[PDB]
């Protein structure tokens, strides 16, 4: 079966909310036993728009990760209904509720591929992963590594971003009781983003180093691409130059200051003498 | 005593200044808020 | 009856609200409808958890769309998942009619009422979901016997009791002759918010990014040239302006806003470009190094 | 009294504002009338709601319910465009 | 609703302990929990002048716009403020200036509860345009 019609995967805010909400609805499982559900969305496009998700009851044990239940029958019956809603809604792939992928996920993937025409395994997390994306999208690939590993079926990442639809986007604002200090439209928002940026870089940066250690000892298989990309980052380095700002901002501001002060200087004598007569008047006026 | 010496004059000022401070504090908060 | 029919202030969750707006939008002018899954507590609280939709048609809402087969079919799926939900009511979208309940829409609401005594009817406006204001209302049917004896303010008791006016015209007139409209509240949860607020891993480096000198230079050139033009104006302006009231000074110096303010606006735009570049310039070099 | 005020409100809301103008060419006694709506395309309406067959008069302007056209009634008369200029 | 509103009542007369409660309730999910988080500090302090409480109620309401929290926040100030009735309009005038029925709703209420006994002229006057308005 094809996994083809993807080069990008955008995911709606609807997708995430549906999984936390659905956890209570089914059984109040709460990621005690990981859930896999259908991932619904558009087709006949290069880009993948994941419009929607619904849960399927799938419990995978915590004794063992090779045993699971996946409710097949629900998938065929839910199929006919999707057209009643809209004819752009078809089964694109499946969702994993995290916290992480498994080797076991290849086997879960073969069953789901029969239904889909463009299966993808997108891990939508029940916990939001950081302030970054709470979603990572992956696609099943047959590849060899020059680590002395013959043919494996594994998950290589494909770029994930968050998108929205015209109907949905409006609805999100109304619902929200946050105002956004992280809007990123203007200078005020932009300065916050820079502080956070540094913190983001640090969180990402640690992982890269532990991965390098694992290969060294605490043996882990080398994904060749990762090592190739790492070395590239260090070589571009140059040193800094210039950039500065003018005295001009102040000049304008001072201009405003003169105008008021001149108006004040004529007004002063008038305003200050009169005060005593009005003051007396006020106290008596107040009583009645 | 109860006529009005200098200590009674002390009590008067004290009383007003103290009472008045908590209310001035709410106004100080408004500037910050 | 006036002695047990009260209005149902509907708490609408993110999963229902978004679903309904999207479904209507794509179909237009084909109208979509469906049953709403939720739970009923109080004698007036309905939380609308989630929705699924019924058959779209090119005449829109009709009797033909409503069959017990679709509903019955759904309920079997509800058991299998182990979701409990009973039916709270039904929804529809009218791009082709106003908020007033069309003659076929009342027929459809009566059938749905036989199944769940407490039934709600919702107009969605998919068209309005394109703009930044969205107007949607929920309603509840009122009985003919109820009107004469009770009168429509009986639905208003022991609940929120906000009665909606969706402009004048057909919408208001149809409201009055047909149903009682009741308000919308949004259910929210902290977790639900947190999902929405989330951005990107990539934005972390985005700010950091050292803005090209080239682009900066384009901005710098653009800023000094406007400034020079305005500078003159500024120079004439200061000879006068002995009086307060800055708007009057704007007519005098010519145009909306003072020329002093125009120069500052430009100085500030440059300042913003400069702020990202210079901060970024040192910051980048040190951290990777 | 207060009473006619309420009769007006009650009649305006049932009647449906805006009323779309028609011209009443002739009345059929079975609860229909043949109206030409002044918007641009003519309609074969019912005579129902606040008017009688005899209450309608030929060559006059009439009120139609905007939502679904039935002829609500004749308050107003229609003068020709021609006659206005000619007349002194 | 019955229980969120009850938490305030039990907590009566401990004063400072209540401070802890407003923040935690707000941290919990639904808007209902957050609402009655505003009532606890106010009931507890009952006619004692406390700077910290008024600041928090005000900041929560402005910072995060939610219908339940903004109405509840304003209403609470009238109880802390109860002991002296004249001070109250000057604080409350700023909330009345904000265009939003829920914010207006509490701002009006706050004046009635505080001024209830010994009143003041200004308090009464502020209420009248809101009465006159078409927003119910």
Half-sphere exposure of E61 (CA within 13 A, CB side): 31
The residue of chain C with its CA nearest to that of D11 is C173
Nearest to A197 among C18, C24, C204 (CB): C204
C228 domain-assigned: yes
Q: Distance between CA atoms of E99 and A62, rounded to whole angstroms? A: 54
C182 domain-assigned: yes
B→E interface, C-beta within 8 Å: 22-23, 25-27, 29-30, 32-33
User: Is C248 touching E (CB cutoff 8 A)?
Assistant: no
**Structure tokens of A72?**
């097949």
State the SS3 of chain C: CCCCCCCCEEEECHHHHHHHHHHHHHHCCCECEEEEEEEEECCCEEEEEEEEECCCECCCCCCCCCCHHHHHHHHHHHHHHCCCCEEEEEEEECCCCCCCCCHHHHHHHHHHHHHCCCCCEEEECCHHHCCCCCCCEEEEECCHHHHHHCCCHHHHCCCCCCCCCCCCHHHHHHHHHHEEEECEEECCCHHHHHHHHCCCCCHHHHCCCCCCHHHHHHHHHHHHHHHHHHHHHHHHHCCCCCCCCHHHHHHHHCCCCCHHHHHHHHHHHHHHHHHHHHHHHHHHHHHHC
Q: Distance between CA atoms of E33 and A224, rounded to whole angstroms? A: 52
Nearest to B25 among E51, E84, E91 (CB): E51
Q: How many domains would you assign to chain C?
A: 2
**Alpha-carbon distances of C67 from C63, C88, E72, rounded to whole Å:** 8, 17, 46
The residue of chain C with its CA nearest to that of D14 is C173
**Structure tokens of D26?**
């002739």
Strand order in the sheet with A9-11: A48-50, A9-11, A160-162
Which of C197, C218, C247 is the endpoint of a domain? Answer: C197
DSSP state letter for E86: S
| Residue appearing with tokens 């009465």 | E131
Q: Are residues C151 and C183 in the same domain?
A: yes
Q: Distance between CA atoms of C36 and C14, rounded to whole angstroms? A: 13
The residue of chain D with its CA nearest to that of C172 is D13
Q: Distance between CA atoms of C6 and C19, rounded to whole angstroms? A: 27
Q: Estimate the share of chain D in helix, then strand, then coil, as percent rounded to the nearest 5.
A: 20, 35, 45
C258 domain-assigned: yes
User: Is C272 touching A (CB cutoff 8 A)?
Assistant: yes
> Under an 8 A CB cutoff, do E66 and A179 touch?
no
Q: Are residues C275 and C172 in the same domain?
A: no
Residues of E in contact with A177 (CB under 8 A): 31, 64-67, 69
Q: Distance between CA atoms of C186 and C12, rounded to whole angstroms? A: 5
Residue of E33, E34, E37, E65 for testing the chain A interface, max A β-carbons within 10 Å: E65
User: Is C239 touching A (CB cutoff 8 A)?
Assistant: no
Q: Distance between CA atoms of C52 and E58, rounded to whole angstroms? A: 41
C288 domain-assigned: no
Which of C197, C219, C250 is the endpoint of a domain? Answer: C197
Phi first, then psi: what are they for E68, rounded to 5°? -60, -50
Instruction: With beta carbons less than 8 A apart as the criterion, state whether C53 and A85 touch.
Output: yes
Residues of B in contact with E94 (CB under 8 A): 30
E strand or H helix that includes residue A192: helix A187-216
Buried b (16+ CB within 10 A) or exposed e, A65-96: eeebebeeebbeebeebbebbbebbbbbbbbb
Q: Are residues C85 and C129 in the same domain?
A: yes
> Which experiment gave this structure?
cryo-EM
> Under an 8 A CB cutoff, do D16 and C176 touch?
no
Instruction: With beta carbons less than 8 A apart as the criterion, state whether E107 and E92 touch.
Output: yes
Q: Are residues C48 and C141 in the same domain?
A: yes
Q: Are residues C66 and C165 in the same domain?
A: yes
**Structure tokens of D22?**
């028609």
Indicate the resolution in Å.
15.4
User: Is D16 touching C (CB cutoff 8 A)?
Assistant: yes
C2 domain-assigned: no
Q: Are residues C20 and C97 in the same domain?
A: yes
State the SS3 of A62-93: CCCCCCECCCCHHHHHHHHHHHHHCCCCEEEE
User: Is D1 touching C (CB cutoff 8 A)?
Assistant: no
Q: Are residues C190 and C226 in the same domain?
A: no
Q: Are residues C130 and C237 in the same domain?
A: no
> Beta-carbon neighbour count of residue A112 at 10 Å?
22
| Residue appearing with tokens 């429509």 | C152
> Beta-carbon neighbour count of residue C45 at 10 Å?
15
Sign, CA dihedral C196-C198-C200-C206, equals: positive
Q: Distance between CA atoms of C92 and C111, rounded to whole angstroms? A: 14
User: Is E48 touching B (CB cutoff 8 A)?
Assistant: no
Residue C270 belongs to domain spanning:
208-282
User: Is E1 touching C (CB cutoff 8 A)?
Assistant: no
Q: Which residues pair with D21 in a beta bridge?
A: D63
- DSSP letters spanning A100-169: ---STHHHHHHHHHTT-SS--EEEE-SS--SSS-SEEEEEEEEEEETTTEEEEEEEEEE-EEE---HHHH
Nearest to C162 among E30, E67, E136 (CB): E136
User: Is D10 touching C (CB cutoff 8 A)?
Assistant: no
Q: Distance between CA atoms of A164 and C247, rounded to whole angstroms? A: 42
Q: Are residues C256 and C181 in the same domain?
A: no
Cβ-count burial of A182 within 10 angstroms (0-12 exposed, 13-18 middle, 19+ buried)? Answer: middle
Q: E touches which chains (3+ CB pairs under 8 A)?
A: A, B, C
Q: Are residues C151 and C224 in the same domain?
A: no
Task: Please state whether beta strands C9-12 and C184-186 pair in parallel, antiparallel, or not at all (unpaired).
Answer: parallel
Range 79-118 of C in CB contact (< 8 A) with A: 80-85
Q: CB pairs below 8 Å between B and E: how many?
A: 22
Q: Distance between CA atoms of A163 and A13, rounded to whole angstroms? A: 8
DSSP state letter for D65: E
Q: Distance between CA atoms of C193 and A128, rounded to whole angstroms? A: 11
Q: Which of E43, E35, E45, E98 is nearest to E71 (CA)?
A: E35
Q: Distance between CA atoms of C185 and C13, rounded to whole angstroms? A: 9
Q: Are residues C229 and C91 in the same domain?
A: no
What is the distance between the terminal CA atoms of chain D, rounded to a whole angstrom? 41
Q: How far is E124 from chain C (nearest CA, A)?
A: 26
Residue A194's SS3 state is helix
Range 239-278 of C in CB contact (< 8 A) with D: none
C1 domain-assigned: no
**Structure tokens of A93?**
């792939």
**Structure tokens of A57?**
């009851």
Range 170-189 of A in CB contact (< 8 A) with E: 177-179
Q: CB pairs below 8 Å between C and D: how many?
A: 15
Does residue E110 come out as left (phi exceeding 0), alpha (psi in the -120 to 50 range) or beta? alpha
DSSP state letter for B10: H
C203 domain-assigned: no
Which of C197, C229, C255 is the endpoint of a domain? Answer: C197
> Under an 8 A CB cutoff, do B26 and E87 touch?
yes
Q: Are residues C181 and C277 in the same domain?
A: no
E/C Cβ contact: 3+ pairs below 8 Å = yes
**Interior angle at CA A56, CA A135 and CA A33, nearest 5:** 75
Q: How far is E66 from chain A (nearest CA, A)?
A: 5
**Structure tokens of C167?**
């402009």
């Amino acid at each position: 079966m094809p996994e083809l019609a993807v080069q990008k995967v955008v995911v709606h805010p609807l997708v995430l909310l549906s999984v936390v909400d659905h956890f209570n609805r089914i059984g109040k499982v709460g990621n005690q036993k990981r859930v896999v559900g259908v991932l619904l969305g558009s087709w006949q496009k290069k880009v993948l728009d994941v419009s929607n998700s619904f849960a399927v009851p799938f419990d995978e044990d915590d004794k063992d990760d090779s045993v699971w239940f996946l409710d097949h029958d629900y998938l065929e019956n839910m199929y006919g209904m999707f057209k009643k809603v809209n004819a752009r809604e078809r089964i694109v792939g499946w969702y994993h509720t995290g916290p992480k992928l498994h080797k076991n996920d290849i086997a879960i993937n073969e069953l789901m591929k029969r239904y889909c025409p463009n299966s993808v395994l997108v891990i939508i997390d029940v916990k939001p992963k950081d302030l970054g994306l709470p979603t990572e999208a992956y696609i099943s690939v047959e590849e060899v590594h020059d680590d002395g590993t013959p043919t494996s079926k594994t998950f290589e990442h494909v770029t994930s971003e968050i998108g929205a639809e015209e109907a949905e986007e409006v609805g999100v604002e109304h619902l929200l009781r946050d105002i956004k200090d992280t809007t990123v439209g203007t200078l005020s928002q932009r300065i916050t983003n820079q502080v956070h940026g540094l913190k983001g870089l640090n969180s990402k940066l640690l992982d890269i180093r532990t991965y390098l250690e694992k290969v060294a000892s605490g043996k882990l298989p080398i994904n060749h691409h990762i090592i190739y990309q790492l070395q590239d980052v260090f070589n571009l380095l140059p040193d800094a130059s210039l950039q500065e700002f003018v005295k001009a901002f102040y000049l304008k501001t001072n201009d405003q200051m003169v105008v008021v002060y001149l108006a004040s200087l004529i007004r002063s004598v008038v305003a200050l003498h009169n005060l005593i007569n009005n003051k007396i008047a006020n106290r008596d006026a107040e009583k009645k | 005593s109860f006529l009005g010496p200098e200590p009674e004059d002390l009590e008067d000022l004290y009383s007003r200044y103290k009472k008045l401070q908590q209310e001035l504090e709410f106004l100080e908060v408004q500037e910050e808020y | 009856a006036p002695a047990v029919d009260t209005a149902e202030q509907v708490y609408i969750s993110s999963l229902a609200l978004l679903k309904m707006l999207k479904h209507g939008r794509a179909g237009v002018p084909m109208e979509v409808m469906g049953l709403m899954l939720g739970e009923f507590v109080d004698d007036y609280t309905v939380r609308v958890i989630d929705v699924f939709a019924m058959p779209q048609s090119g005449t829109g809402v009709s009797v033909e769309a409503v069959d017990p087969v679709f509903q019955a079919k759904m309920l079997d799926m509800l058991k299998q998942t182990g979701r409990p939900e009973m039916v709270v009511g039904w929804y529809h979208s009218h791009p082709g009619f106003g908020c007033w309940l069309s003659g076929v829409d009342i027929n459809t609401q009566q059938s749905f009422e036989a199944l769940s005594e407490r039934a709600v009817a919702v107009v969605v406006d998919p068209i309005q979901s394109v703009k930044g204001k969205v107007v949607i209302d929920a309603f509840r049917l009122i009985n003919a016997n109820m009107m004469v004896l009770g009168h429509e303010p009986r639905q208003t008791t022991s609940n929120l009791g906000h009665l909606n006016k969706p402009s004048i015209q057909a919408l208001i007139h149809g409201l009055n002759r047909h149903y009682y409209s009741i308000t919308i509240n949004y259910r929210k949860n902290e977790l639900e918010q947190k999902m929405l607020l989330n951005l990107h891993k990539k934005s972390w480096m985005e700010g950091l990014t050292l803005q090209d000198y080239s682009e900066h230079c384009k901005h710098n050139e653009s800023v000094v040239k406007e400034m020079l033009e305005l500078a003159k104006n500024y120079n004439k302006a200061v000879e006068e302006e002995d009086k307060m009231t800055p708007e009057q000074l704007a007519i005098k110096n010519v145009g909306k806003q003072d020329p002093k303010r125009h120069l500052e606006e430009h100085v500030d735009v440059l300042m913003t470009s400069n702020i990202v570049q210079c901060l970024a310039a040192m910051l980048d070099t040190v951290v990777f190094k | 009294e207060e009473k006619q005020e309420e009769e007006r409100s009650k009649v305006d809301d049932l009647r449906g504002t805006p009323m779309s103008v028609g011209t009443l060419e002739e009345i059929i006694d079975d609860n229909h009338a043949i109206v030409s709506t002044s918007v641009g395309s003519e309609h074969y309406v019912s005579i129902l709601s606040f008017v009688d067959k005899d209450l309608l008069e030929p060559g006059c302007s009439v009120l139609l319910n905007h939502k679904v056209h039935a002829v609500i009634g004749v308050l107003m008369d229609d003068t020709d465009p021609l006659v206005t200029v000619m007349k002194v | 609703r019955g229980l969120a509103v009850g938490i305030a009542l039990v907590m009566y007369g401990r004063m400072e302990e209540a401070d802890a409660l407003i923040e935690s309730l707000c941290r919990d999910k639904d808007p209902i929990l957050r609402r009655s988080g505003m009532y606890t500090v106010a009931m507890a302090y009952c006619g004692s002048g406390n700077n910290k409480a008024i600041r928090r109620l005000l900041h929560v309401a402005v910072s995060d716009v939610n219908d339940d929290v903004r109405r509840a926040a304003v209403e609470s100030l009238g109880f802390i403020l109860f002991r002296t009735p004249e001070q109250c309009p000057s604080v409350v005038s700023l909330l009345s200036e904000s265009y939003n029925p829920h914010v207006r709703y509490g701002a009006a209420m706050a004046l009635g509860v505080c001024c209830a006994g010994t009143g003041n002229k200004e308090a009464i006057n502020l209420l009248e345009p809101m009465t006159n308005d078409p927003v119910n």
